[PDB]
Amino acid sequence: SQIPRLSAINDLHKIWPTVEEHGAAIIESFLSLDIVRRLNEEVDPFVKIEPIPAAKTKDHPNHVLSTTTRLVNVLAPISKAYREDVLNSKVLHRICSDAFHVYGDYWVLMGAVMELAPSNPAQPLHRDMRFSHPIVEYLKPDAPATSINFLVALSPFTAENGATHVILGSHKWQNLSNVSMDATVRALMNPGDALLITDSTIHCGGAETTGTETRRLLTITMGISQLTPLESNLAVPRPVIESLTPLAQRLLGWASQRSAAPRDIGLLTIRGNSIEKTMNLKAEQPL
């Protein structure tokens, strides 16, 4: 029983309901091949100079990822394609406003390119967020998902090169005795396709068995604005921020945020006024 594959345009309204039901879905052509090309070109060197996740020079080493994983986040200052095309993706936002309407505004918890070296082993089956947001474990099991993860293929995902594994329905599992690779299916994707899961979906990167291919993805963890992002844009240069749309600015923490509470008093406000209003933050200004 395989992962449901949906069209990004034809099937748009069906994507989140599918994920909310089965815990994963494949969005075909989530990003056009042109945007994939530009993303790749724009991140390439930063991937090449990224060290091992737990590198001794980092003051927040990542000990969980394998030393053959490279992860580069805070993509806005690196990539025009990301901060213009990806952050304003209309598919991304209809899915996110579908999934999060119960909670209110959403933003990027983390936008990151992961490239896995040849023969990178499968990851352990996991739920995301358990090394950053322990509060999530304390949610009632039927609480609506507070973050979701777009795993976007920047190169081909094949069974042989390590395409991600998911366990269908595992986002509703409380008893974990059922957990094992036996229960998984694969996300077979062309570049630009995206695998979409929730923070409860049990999944892992697969084993790279060709010993040659280098697999690369863009993982966009979108979450309610009530949860703190894994990454900071505080250091992104103001001229970059002001080149963006207001929507993009909000997604990066450069705007105030709102809950869905009918009388919402808002998040990250300043004496009752927004960040952008207070700071007179320009938008969509070219560089």
Ligand X SMILES: O=C(O)CCC(=O)C(=O)O
Ligand Y SMILES: CN1C(=O)c2ccccc2NC(=O)[C@H]1Cc1ccccc1
Residue 136 CB, shortest distance to ligand X, in Å, is: 14
Question: Considering only CA atoms, which of 26, 208, 27 is closest in space to residue 117?
Answer: 208
Q: Which does 218 bind (CB under 5 to 8 A by kind): ligand X, ligand Y, Fe ion, none?
A: none
Residue 230 CB, shortest distance to ligand Y, in Å, is: 7
Q: Which is nearer to ligand Y, 198 or 221 (CB)?
A: 221
Q: Which does 115 bind (CB under 5 to 8 A by kind): ligand X, ligand Y, Fe ion, none?
A: none
Binding residues for ligand Y, per CB under 6 A?
A: 62, 64-65, 71, 110, 112, 123-124, 126, 128-131, 219, 221
Binding residues for ligand X, per CB under 6 A?
A: 114, 123, 128, 151, 164, 203, 205, 217
Residue 133 CB, shortest distance to ligand Y, in Å, is: 8
The 3-state DSSP class for residue 152 equals strand
Measure the CA–CA gap between 56 and 14, rounded to whole angstroms. 45
Tokens 């394609």 — which residue? 81
Measure the CA–CA gap between 53 and 62, rounded to whole angstroms. 5
Half-sphere exposure of 26 (CA within 13 A, CB side): 21
Decide if 44 contacts 154 (C-beta within 8 A). Answer: no
Q: Which does 164 bind (CB under 5 to 8 A by kind): ligand X, Fe ion, ligand Y, none?
A: ligand X
Q: Which is nearer to ligand X, 52 or 281 (CB)?
A: 52
Q: Which is nearer to Fe ion, 115 or 128 (CB)?
A: 128
Residue 80 CB, shortest distance to ligand X, in Å, is: 25
Residue 71 CB, shortest distance to ligand X, in Å, is: 7
What is the footprint of Fe ion within residues 118-157 (CB under 5 A)? 128
Environment class of 237 (CB within 10 Å of its CB; exposed 0-12, middle 13-18, buried 19+): exposed
- What CA–CA distances, in Å, run from 31 to 2, 4, 21? 22, 18, 23
Determine the residue with CB nearest Fe ion. 128
- The reply to whether 203 sits in an annotated binding site is yes
Order the strands of the 203-204 sheet from edge to edge: 185-186, 165-166, 203-204
Tokens 């091949």 — which residue? 33
Q: Which is nearer to Fe ion, 195 or 244 (CB)?
A: 195
Q: Which is nearer to ligand Y, 92 or 129 (CB)?
A: 129
Count of CB atoms within 10 A of residue 284's CB?
Answer: 12
Q: Which does 131 bind (CB under 5 to 8 A by kind): Fe ion, ligand X, ligand Y, none?
A: ligand Y
Q: Which is nearer to Fe ion, 121 or 246 (CB)?
A: 121
The 3-state DSSP class for residue 158 equals coil
Residue 167 CB, shortest distance to Fe ion, in Å, is: 12
Decide if 10 contacts 194 (C-beta within 8 A). Answer: no
Tokens of residue 241, six digits: 């921020």
Binding site for Fe ion (CB under 5 A): 128
**Binding site residues, as ranges?**
126, 128, 203
